[PDB]
């Protein structure tokens, strides 16, 4: 059951560290891996940590 606890911990860390907020005056540029992916509007958003950067 310890492996299940570890899986829960890692998925919780994945969900918690992924959320980010950007100010209203700002607009985010999100790049999937090293390649540009899209533009994000000024609100709370979620991104996969270590996968894409804003």
């Amino acid at each position: 059951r310890v492996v299940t606890i570890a899986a829960a911990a890692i998925v919780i860390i994945w969900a918690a560290s992924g959320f980010y907020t950007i100010k209203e005056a700002e607009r985010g540029v999100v790049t999937r891996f090293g390649k540009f992916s899209h533009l994000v509007e000024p609100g709370l958003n979620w991104k996969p940590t270590f996968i894409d950067e804003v």
Binding site: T21, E24, L44
Partner: protein, 55 residues
Amino acid sequence: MRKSVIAIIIIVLVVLYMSVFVVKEGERGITLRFGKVLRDDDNKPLVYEPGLHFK
């Protein structure tokens, strides 16, 4: 059932005290949730009149 009731009362009171904010007469307030401002009435930015409002 004595600690629980006083605890819930005090936390509710402190939450309400945090929630309330007053806009002075000479000023006007703009509210920010995360980054953006609140929009109302068909995507128009809203400004708070000098009255008590809840956040």
